[PDB]
Amino acid sequence: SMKINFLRNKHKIHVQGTDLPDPIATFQQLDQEYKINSRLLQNILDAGFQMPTPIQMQAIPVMLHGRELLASAPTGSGKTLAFSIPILMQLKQPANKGFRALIISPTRELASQIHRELIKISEGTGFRIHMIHKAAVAAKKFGPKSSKKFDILVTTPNRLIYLLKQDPPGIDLASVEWLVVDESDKLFEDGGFRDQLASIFLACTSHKVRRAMFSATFAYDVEQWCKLNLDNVISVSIGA
Numbered sequence: 001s002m003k004i005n006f007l008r009n010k011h012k013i014h015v016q017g018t019d020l021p022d023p024i025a026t027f028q029q030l031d032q033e034y035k036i037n038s039r040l041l042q043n044i045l046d047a048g049f050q051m052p053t054p055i056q057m058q059a060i061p062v063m064l065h066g067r068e069l070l071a072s073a074p075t076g077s078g079k080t081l082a083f084s085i086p087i088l089m090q091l092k093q094p095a096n097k098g099f100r101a102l103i104i105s106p107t108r109e110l111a112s113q114i115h116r117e118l119i120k121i122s123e124g125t126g127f128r129i130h131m132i133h134k135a136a137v138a139a140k141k142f143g144p145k146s147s148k149k150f151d152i153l154v155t156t157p158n159r160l161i162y163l164l165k166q167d168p169p170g171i172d173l174a175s176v177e178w179l180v181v182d183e184s185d186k187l188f189e190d191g192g193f194r195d196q197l198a199s200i201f202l203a204c205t206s207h208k209v210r211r212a213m214f215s216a217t218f219a220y221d222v223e224q225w226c227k228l229n230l231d232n233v234i235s236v237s238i239g240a
C-alpha cells in the first residue's frame with residue numbers, strides 16, 4: 001500500500017486501467033506469489049539481474065494476471081525480460097502443442113536478439129524457442145503436419161504473414177496464448193502493419209489468447225489503437 005505507492009512513485013511507473021495488479025518489488029516475490037520454475041529464477045539471478053527494472057516490476061504481474069497490456073519504456077529498460085518471464089511462467093513446461101507464444105519484432109536483427117535472450121534465460125528448462133528461417137519455411141518444418149514439439153516463436157510481421165498465407169498454411173496459431181508486439185511504435189510508423197496485425201490476431205483462435213504491445217515511446221496511435229482494439233487494456237509507462 002505505502003509499499004506499493006512507493007514502488008510506483010520512486011520508479012516512475014505510470015499506470016492506467018481498471019483492476020490493476022500490484023507491481024512486484026523483487027524477483028523473489030515471484031517464487032512466493034506465482035511459484036516460478038526454480039531453474040528459471042536461478043537463471044535470472046545468475047545473469048546478474050538482481051532486481052527487476054521498473055517496466056518488469058509492473059509489466060510482469062499484468063501479464064501473469066492475463067491482462068492485455070500496452071507497455072512503454074525507453075530503450076535500455078529491460079522490455080525483453082518484461083515479456084519473456086511471464087510467457088515462460090504461463091507456459092509452465094515445454095509441450096508438444098505447437099507454438100503457444102508468438103513475439104513479433106520489426107527486423108531479423110531485433111528478433112535474433114530476443115531469441116538469444118530467451119534461449120539464455122530458459123537454459124535447462126527444455127523450452128524450444130525458434131525463429132523460422134527461409135530453409136525451414138521451404139521445409140515446412142513447423143507446419144501443422146509436423147511434430148509440434150516447439151513452444152515459442154520469435155519473428156517479423158512479413159515472415160509470419162508469409163507462413164499464414166502459404167497454401168496450405170506453413171504455421172498454425174491455434175494454441176498461441178500470448179501474442180507480443182515488440183517495438184510497436186516503430187512498426188506503426190514503418191507500415192499496413194495495422195491490417196497485418198488484424199489478420200495475425202484473427203488466426204490466433206485460442207480461448208486463452210492475450211495481447212501485449214511493447215514500445216519505446218508512449219505514442220498516440222499505438223495508445224488509441226490499443227484502447228480501441230485490446231480488451232480492458234492496462235497501460236504502463238515509465239516516466240523519464
Ligand SMILES: Nc1ncnc2c1ncn2[C@@H]1O[C@H](COP(=O)(O)OP(=O)(O)O)[C@@H](O)[C@H]1O
Pocket residue numbers: 048049050051052053056073074075076077078079080081
Ligand atoms: N532486471 C535486470 N537487471 C539488470 N539488467 C537487466 C535486467 N533486465 C534486463 N537487463 C539488461 O538490460 C539491457 C537491455 O535490456 P533490453 O531488453 O534490450 O531493453 P529494451 O528492450 O527496453 O531496450 C540488457 O543487456 C539486459 O540484459
Ligand SMILES: [Mg+2]
Pocket residue numbers: 079080
Ligand atoms: Mg528491446
